[PDB]
C-alpha cells in the first residue's frame, strides 16, 4: 500500500497471507468462515501454497500464527485473463482455522446491497509501500 | 524491497463506475468497482486482499484487490473485483462443496 499506515495488531482478523512453501508472500486474502478463503483469480494459488492466518509483523516470529494447507482451489470459471474480469478464487482449506480475536471472518454482502460513491472504505495488505 | 514488515491499511472512497471510466474507459466491466485516486493506492503484494466498508457496524467485503496503474499511481483509481456481482457464485460453491 502506497501511503498507508501501520495497522493495530489484530484489528483486521480476516486478513491472510498467501505464501509459497518456502515462506514468500505473493498475495493477500480474506477468511469468510473457518474453512474458506476468498482471493484473486490472477494470484494463481495452488495446493502447494499456504494460508498464514493471525499474522502481523512478517519480520517477527513470536506472534502465534496458523499455517493452513489448501485442499482445493476454485477459480471462477468465467475469469478472463485478457480483461481481468471475474477475478475471484475460493480456497478450500484442508485444515480449518481456529477463530479468536486475531483470527475471524469478514462479512459478505448480498447481491442486492449497494455501496454508494464517496463512501469511505478500507483496504489492507503487505504490498509495496513504493514503486 | 519496498515491502513493509507490518500490516498496512489505507482509507479511500468508492468511485462511481462512470467517474472511474474517465480513467480506464473501456477497461471497466460490471464485475469491477473502483476506489482510490485520493493519494493512496494498492501496489504489488496487495492482490487478493480486502476492500471493506461498514454495514451496520460489521465490516463487509465490497471488493478484492485486482489491478490498477502499473506504477501504483496514488492519483489513479484502483480496480477491485466487485463482490456483490460475484457473491452468488460463492454461495453456490460454498453450498455445493
Amino acid at each position: 500500500i502506497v501511503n498507508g499506515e501501520e495497522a493495530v495488531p489484530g484489528s483486521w482478523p480476516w486478513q491472510v497471507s498467501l505464501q509459497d512453501k518456502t515462506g514468500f508472500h505473493f498475495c493477500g486474502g480474506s477468511l469468510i468462515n473457518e474453512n474458506w478463503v476468498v482471493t484473486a483469480a490472477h494470484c494463481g494459488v495452488t495446493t502447494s501454497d499456504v494460508v498464514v492466518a493471525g499474522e502481523f509483523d512478517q519480520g517477527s516470529s513470536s506472534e502465534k500464527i496458523q499455517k493452513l494447507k489448501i485442499a482445493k482451489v476454485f477459480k471462477n470459471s468465467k475469469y478472463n485473463s485478457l480483461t481481468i474480469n471475474n477475478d475471484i478464487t475460493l480456497l478450500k482449506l484442508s485444515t480449518a482455522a481456529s477463530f479468536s480475536q486475531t483470527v475471524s471472518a469478514v462479512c459478505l454482502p448480498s447481491a442486492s446491497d449497494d455501496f454508494a460513491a464517496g463512501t469511505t472504505c478500507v483496504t489492507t495488505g503487505w504490498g509495496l509501500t513504493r514503486y | 524491497a519496498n515491502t513493509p514488515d507490518r500490516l498496512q491499511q489505507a482509507s479511500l472512497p468508492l468511485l462511481s463506475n462512470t467517474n472511474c471510466k474517465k480513467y480506464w474507459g473501456t477497461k471497466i466491466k460490471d464485475a469491477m468497482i473502483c476506489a482510490g485516486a485520493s493519494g493512496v493506492s494498492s501496489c504489488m503484494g496487495d492482490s487478493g486482499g480486502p476492500l471493506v466498508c461498514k454495514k451496520n457496524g460489521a465490516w463487509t467485503l465490497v471488493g478484492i484487490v485486482s489491478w490498477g496503474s502499473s506504477t501504483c499511481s496514488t492519483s489513479t483509481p484502483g480496480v477491485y473485483a466487485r463482490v456483490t456481482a460475484l457473491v452468488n457464485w460463492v454461495q453456490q460453491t460454498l453450498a455445493a462443496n
Binding site: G10, Q101, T102, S104, V106, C107, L108, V122 | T60
Partner: peptide, 10 residues
C-alpha cells in the same frame, strides 16, 4: 462476522 475483537484505529 465483521466485528473485530481488537478495534481498528483508522
Amino acid at each position: 462476522c465483521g466485528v473485530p475483537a481488537i478495534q481498528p484505529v483508522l
